[PDB]
Design a protein around this nucleic acid. Sequence first.
DNA 1: CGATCACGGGG
DNA 2: GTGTACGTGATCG
Length: 758
Amino acid sequence: HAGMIIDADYITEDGKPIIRIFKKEKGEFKVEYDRTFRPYIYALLKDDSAIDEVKKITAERHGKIVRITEVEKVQKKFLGRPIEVWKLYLEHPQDVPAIREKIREHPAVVDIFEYDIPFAKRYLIDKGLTPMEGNEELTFLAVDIETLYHEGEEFGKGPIIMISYADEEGAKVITWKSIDLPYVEVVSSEREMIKRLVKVIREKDPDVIITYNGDNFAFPYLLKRAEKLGIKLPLGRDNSEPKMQRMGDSLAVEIKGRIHFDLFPVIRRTINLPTYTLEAVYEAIFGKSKEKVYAHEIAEAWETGKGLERVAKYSMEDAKVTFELGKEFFPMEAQLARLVGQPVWDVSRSSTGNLVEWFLLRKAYERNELAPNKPDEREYERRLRESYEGVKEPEKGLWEGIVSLDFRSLYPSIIITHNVSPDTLNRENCKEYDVAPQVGHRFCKDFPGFIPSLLGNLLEERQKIKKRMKESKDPVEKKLLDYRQRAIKILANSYYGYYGYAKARWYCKECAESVTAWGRQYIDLVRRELESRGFKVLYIDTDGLYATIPGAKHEEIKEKALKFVEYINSKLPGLLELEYEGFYARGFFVTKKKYALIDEEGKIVTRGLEIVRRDWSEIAKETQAKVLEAILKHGNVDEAVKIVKEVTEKLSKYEIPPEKLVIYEQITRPLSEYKAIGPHVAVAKRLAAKGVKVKPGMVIGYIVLRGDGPISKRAIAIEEFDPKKHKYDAEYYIENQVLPAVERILRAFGYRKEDLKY
DNA sequence: CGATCACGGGG
DNA sequence: GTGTACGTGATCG
Ligand SMILES: [Mg+2]
Ligand SMILES: [Mg+2]
């Protein structure tokens, strides 16, 4: 029909699957049901006669036997060649994992294909359905919670003490203690506060629920407390509860009929930050400071009843900026969903590698191209161990007035012009081919490759959008078209990386190597042209470079660099484009994707160096921050080396507060399941021995004490530490904490680990 | 050594 | 759900 598709899933009714398509039609929520779409896989057989044995293969599920309902001989393409496979139909999606191994094991079966595509994704592809089409306006609600937390408690032990939400009508706080603020609704209990959140969500009926780390905190915490309090959370538009899906080592939460938009994985991909706290994220995007009120300050205010107005304001600002950030980041995710043809829920939680793959699976269907399979563990491992031939060590020391150049828009044009594809690689009986420089891989020119063909269409579509943008008087159309052309740029600039992605179906080591080798000819041209203009290249990798004019005035460097980019792009043919990325007052480079810079507004920017994580001591993270600050803010490496030397001496003379030595590590499974007992497990087992209910999710704080052997046998629980009796291991905090934190940084200045002590 | 195990965001 | 991240660095055995 007419509506915008926002999501799709399936339900089972009388044992049979039913697809649900969630739509928004002129402001109204609509669900379309489809009972007719059938699950399937493909099987390549050694001979057609074999189908008679194969169609009779069975399996078991839900106490019932699983059978192949129908078989169909089909003509498709595999690796740019016609092939005949058998389409095997199944009644239920859950029949596919139950029977697939029993088909694959059969001696007459060469291989099986497309056996791990989720039903809802299979449906959108096969039916040619695209989410997020049209000008349909969605509604948004940001949600956040504050809880009572004490160090090392099991997840969900303390109550939720506040629930905040925000939309265009304002930011509000729901709490069960008396706070006199205009945006605070006081209720009688935690139970009544959670039921109030349920009522707000059911009444506001948002299409999109925005959270900041809601997948792994707000919603698992709400579900834990609702379970304890024996109450339901009917937040789904079908009155279903939020659903926790194990997505890797972490969680993802869905709300049926809506889009649960968690900003945390979204922003982590979009921008570069050493730490993605909401306060650091808000400041990077809106250029305004946001105060952080820490867990201990919140617990103290709740328990004493003093300073609750500050905690309520913190809760309110958390929802207010979550709404603001959601409106900022949602349009690009909506266009990416549309482009790749999968819902925002899925697209916002995936890498660019998986965005490419879903775009390719859809295009393979449209072109009757059988998809290759994801690799098994051994293949994936063999791919990670593959060595690529044919990006030097960066210049040492501290440089001033650094311009950053980006090469990424070069590679789609290389893939297309040289027909770089796994289906064109080293083709037999090829009349014409392109030979990659240095590496010598041959790509057949006789037919367009599957991936070059698609990229060519993407680039052409982006140029049409850019042309329609120049000719548009409507600023609403322009804004939308700007997002659409940026979505293409993002997807197209991900193919180069996708070729080398070990999990990729269309993985091609020789394709990735060849793109690099052809790419290098232009990079070498950019580098020679920069050096002829007095520029010194400080750092270069496949994504870009950093350069300066040694000792030149900063405005002269900026002007010359901007003039250079305009010049080289006038020389480069086709859609090959170099981009001026930015300018930095100072910076230094350690190795590949290990560097630190500082811009003219004094903001430090690093890659592959900062260690802001709870399993490193504060003394190591504080010393590291001080070293970066001495180098970038003071331009003084000598001050940085003196900071390390002073810290190490203070550690040796037991002059460092024990609180700066605490290491935190989470328990992730029952204690009896550990194969290797690390210091936090050794500490945990002693706590459980004393009667402490140790559970997965509990974070263990410990200090390493002086003594013989592995650190596991010398770690003490932070609560058991007695400064009068226990002596911390100075050698451990020096050699395993402080020195590894700074040694990579100071190696860029010619210092070895042994020169950072008195 | 190879294997195992943790980090992030959020209170 | 036709499912179970990612890349990297510390410590155990
Ligand atoms: Mg879903
Ligand atoms: Mg909050």
